[PDB]
Design a protein around this ligand. Structure first.
Ligand SMILES: Nc1ncnc2c1ncn2[C@@H]1O[C@H](COP(=O)(O)O)[C@@H](OP(=O)(O)O)[C@H]1O
Length: 246
């Protein structure tokens, strides 16, 4: 098996639902940040090294391609950070893979981002996210990798991540650049709520019969997950409250 679909959409654009939709279509695994968190935390340092490699005056592109290939072995698709930030590299490695750009209203996106992936540095809720994630074994190394992958997607070394106005403009620019770089016939822009129809047409498959398009990972559910991790201190003890997520 090899990469068939490259998900270029940013975090909080429906990437977990797209991951699930691609797993339904292909009956093979799709990579996502949740693969790292819930199945393979040893991947954190590997991603960090690949991102660090991009910051060298002379980066080793073959080291990056080889590292991506090893990370994605056994997967049919990629979505979410950190992989989305490498969509150009993945297009080169997998010239026959199609590209998906999941997208949504930028104000809704920013709101969701601040609730889940990138709270402002002095937002009290950041401390709660961190306390809940500690239950999962997630610590500062994960947050560094996540933030560095977002900065790499936005092509900025120094950026004030606490400035909403900057993030909104980075979002629009990132999505504009995907549409500029990817040949139209190789790209599907999938707006939140678009469902199976356009996706299945683009991938040359029928709409899965009787299977609805996935709809999980809302910020409401993430807030509940953080709170229940804090309260019970065990993922196993609470996972029955969160079907269809991990
Ligand atoms: N089928 C669907 N229809 C509408 N929104 C969806 C959806 N699947 C996921 N989403 C939204 O996509 C966001 C999650 O994205 P990701 O999986 O990339 O982190 C959440 O936004 P909200 O946080 O605004 O609820 C979630 O509600």
């Amino acid at each position: 098996t090899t990469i068939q679909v490259i998900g270029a959409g940013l975090p909080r654009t429906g990437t977990n639902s797209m991951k699930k939709a691609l797993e339904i279509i292909y009956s093979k695994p799709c990579y996502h940040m949740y693969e790292i968190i819930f199945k393979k935390q040893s991947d954190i340092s590997i991603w960090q090294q690949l991102i660090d490699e991009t910051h060298k005056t002379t980066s080793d592109k073959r080291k990056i391609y080889n590292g991506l290939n090893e990370l994605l072995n056994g997967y049919i698709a990629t979505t979410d950070l950190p992989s989305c930030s490498f969509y150009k590299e993945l297009m080169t490695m997998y010239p026959n893979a199609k590209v998906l750009l999941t997208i949504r209203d930028k104000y809704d996106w920013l709101y969701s981002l601040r609730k889940v992936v990138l709270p402002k540095s002095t937002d009290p809720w950041k401390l709660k996210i961190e306390e809940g994630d500690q239950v999962l074994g997630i610590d500062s190394n994960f947050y560094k990798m996540s933030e560095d992958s977002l900065k790499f997607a936005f092509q900025k070394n120094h950026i004030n991540l606490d400035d909403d106005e900057i993030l909104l403009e980075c979002y629009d620019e990132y999505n504009r650049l995907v549409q500029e770089i990817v040949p139209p016939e190789r790209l599907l822009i999938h707006h939140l709520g678009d469902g199976w129809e356009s996706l299945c047409q683009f991938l040359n498959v029928d709409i899965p019969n009787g299977i609805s398009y996935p709809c999980a990972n809302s910020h409401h559910q993430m807030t509940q997950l953080t709170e229940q991790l804090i309260k019970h201190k065990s993922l196993d003890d609470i996972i029955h409250m969160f079907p269809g997520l991990i």
